Amino acid sequence: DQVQLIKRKDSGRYEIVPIEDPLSFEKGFYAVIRACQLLAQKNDGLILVGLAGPSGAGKTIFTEKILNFMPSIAIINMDNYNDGTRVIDGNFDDPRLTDYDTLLDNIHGLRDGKPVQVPIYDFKSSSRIGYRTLEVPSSRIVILEGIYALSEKLRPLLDLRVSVTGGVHFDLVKRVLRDIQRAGQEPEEIIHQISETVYPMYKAFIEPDLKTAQIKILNKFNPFSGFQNPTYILKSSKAVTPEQMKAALSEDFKERTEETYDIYLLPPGEDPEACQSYLRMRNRDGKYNLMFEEWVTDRPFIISPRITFEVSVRLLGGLMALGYTIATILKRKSHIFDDDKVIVKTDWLEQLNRTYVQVQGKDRTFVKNVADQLGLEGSYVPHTYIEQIQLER
Length: 393
Ligand SMILES: Nc1ncnc2c1ncn2[C@@H]1O[C@H](COP(=O)(O)OP(=O)(O)CP(=O)(O)O)[C@@H](O)[C@H]1O
Ligand SMILES: [Mg+2]
Ligand code: NA
Hints:
There is one protein chain. The chain has a domain at about 5-220: P-loop containing nucleotide triphosphate hydrolases (Rossmann fold), CATH 3.40.50. Helix content is about 30%, strand content about 30%. The chain contains 11 helices and 20 strands. It has helices at about 25-40, 60-70, 100-110, 165-180, 185-200, 200-210, 225-230, 240-250, 315-320, 365-375, 385-390; strands spanning about 5, 15, 20-25, 45-50, 75, 115-120, 125-135, 140-145, 160-165, 215-220, 230-235, 255-265, 280-285, 290, 295-300, 300-305, 310, 325-340, 340-350, 355-360. The strands form 4 sheets. Strands 15-16-11-20-19-18-12-13-14-17 form a 10-stranded antiparallel sheet. A 6-stranded parallel sheet has the order 3-10-9-4-8-5, sandwiched between helices. The protein has a two-stranded antiparallel ribbon with strand order 1-2. A hairpin with a 4-residue loop joins strand 6 (about 115-120) and strand 7. The longest helix is centred in the first third of the chain and has 18 residues, at about 25-40. The structure holds phosphomethylphosphonic acid adenylate ester (ACP), magnesium ion and sodium ion. The site of sodium ion has 2 residues, from loops. It is found in: Mitochondrion outer membrane.
């Protein structure tokens, strides 16, 4: 865990000695920070670090913890370099999406001290909407975060190669194992076959790059962290119009609309319309998200950690190949007001032909009072949408 430097023979710049042992999330967080402090005291110019890993392993929450610890660093999200015209698919996992010409040019400019125009990618329209000016930050630390941040085209220009594995990406594999395990099967052999089925590109394209990491962070998933800081939801059948929300709520609430499509998946086996733990595939603005449906009902609230990570549609085919079945499809159209801390929205679901109001957030007192501000008392429905269609048979 001791970070030490060694002069890389190809240049005069020093480099971190590879830590062969995988590291904890909290310990890897401190190993990365101290490695940057040492690399910035022994090498001049830009300190570029590649942060690679699968979707869901925790590299996003890793970055936003480094940013809150050090606001003087800049984070570059590698998916902003995507070019939808390169592939005919919409799979974000596809390594053929990144425009390496713009990427490599951006890092050569930042190495020469120049500010560069880094692209901004809108997944809803699947196009590059514009650019943002990124100067070399004060810390001179730039984090390139992406699934292929340790690709062969980027390793010569990286000063530190960090990989993040595990998280909810691996927890889904253990969850599927809990659902489909048969007696006599060696668990490590089934785990391997689950990963090949549900993540058909991890072993081939993603993992080989992660082995070349100098700090290998293994993020062990915590099932109890979600319910420590969960999402509190109040659902109402009242007809609070979006015009009434705009006026009642503060001007800090930003207004937006969206259409989502939820696919509810049941595990294989005979759940007699009960003991049913759903997996939810959500489609929203060009992204597919897998969600775990772990719910507690404290009237009038409904509470859930809302554990979710981005997945390819291929994951749906893999789950169904492993016995998971589609219970129902829920198509909705939503009108959202977002305080960035509290969300007040109205959802219209086609299958119910009804309109519901939803106040959600991580601060339970903030959710209750905002719902009281809209006069929602006496109209609460403490049930999930999938539970409402079940009740209205
Ligand atoms: N050790 C852990 N304990 C609890 N939750 C964890 C976890 N590691 C990862 N997660 C969960 O993983 C989810 C998504 O991971 P995160 O966004 O942090 O990294 P990521 O970039 O790989 C996913 P995405 O690509 O969709 O952004 C979050 O809901 C987070 O709570
Ligand atoms: Mg539901
Ligand atoms: Na069995």
